[PDB]
């Protein structure tokens, strides 16, 4: 049907918007602390602490598989990157501090993406 293509044209354009958003969020992590998953060979106990690991490469695989149905799902994954870090790492660490910064700096980008998604459907 022609209805499923119109949707596929929107999902695709939602994918195009979220890709740009992801690039902008990742620019706020120049140390690349959140780039890749936490290594299980280097932190073997990680999963005893964190039940839903998240990172930018894992979000990118999902994104290119058009696996985000809306902005809220995308934001949930971003929030996990931050919240995981703030739990696992203590307050006086480079890692916790990098998450506080990414959160604060991402807020501006996610503000405008809510308006852009609403505005363009």
Curated annotation (Swiss-Prot):
Bromo domain location, by residue? Answer: 9-113
Q: In which tissues or organs does this protein occur?
A: Highly expressed in testis.
Compartments, record wording: Nucleus; Chromosome
Lineage top rank: taxon: Eukaryota
The annotated crosslink position for Glycyl lysine isopeptide (Lys-Gly) (interchain with G-Cter in SUMO2) is 41
Q: What does the subunit section of this Swiss-Prot or TrEMBL entry state? A: Component of some HBO1 complex composed of KAT7/HBO1, MEAF6, ING4 and BRD1/BRPF2. Component of the MOZ/MORF complex composed at least of ING5, KAT6A, KAT6B, MEAF6 and one of BRPF1, BRD1/BRPF2 and BRPF3. Interacts (via PHD-type zinc finger domain) with unmodified histone H3. Interacts (via PWWP domain) with dimethylated and trimethylated 'Lys-79' on histone H3.
Q: What does this protein do?
A: Scaffold subunit of various histone acetyltransferase (HAT) complexes, such as the MOZ/MORF and HBO1 complexes, that acts as a regulator of hematopoiesis. Plays a key role in HBO1 complex by directing KAT7/HBO1 specificity towards histone H3 'Lys-14' acetylation (H3K14ac), thereby promoting erythroid differentiation.
Q: What is this protein called?
A: Bromodomain-containing protein 1
| Residues shown, of full length | 555 to 674 of 1058
């Amino acid at each position: 049907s022609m209805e499923q293509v119109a949707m596929e044209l929107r999902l695709t354009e939602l994918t195009r918007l979220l890709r740009s958003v992801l690039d902008q969020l990742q620019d706020k992590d120049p140390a690349r602390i959140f780039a890749q998953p936490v290594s299980l060979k280097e932190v073997p106990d990680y999963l005893d602490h964190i039940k839903h690991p998240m990172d930018f490469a894992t979000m990118r695989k999902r994104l290119e598989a058009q696996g985000y149905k809306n902005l809220h799902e995308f934001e949930e994954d971003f929030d996990l990157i931050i919240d995981n870090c703030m739990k696992y790492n203590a307050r006086d660490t480079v890692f916790y501090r990098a998450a506080v910064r990414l959160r604060d700096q991402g807020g501006v980008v996610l503000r405008q993406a809510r308006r852009e998604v609403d505005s363009i459907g």
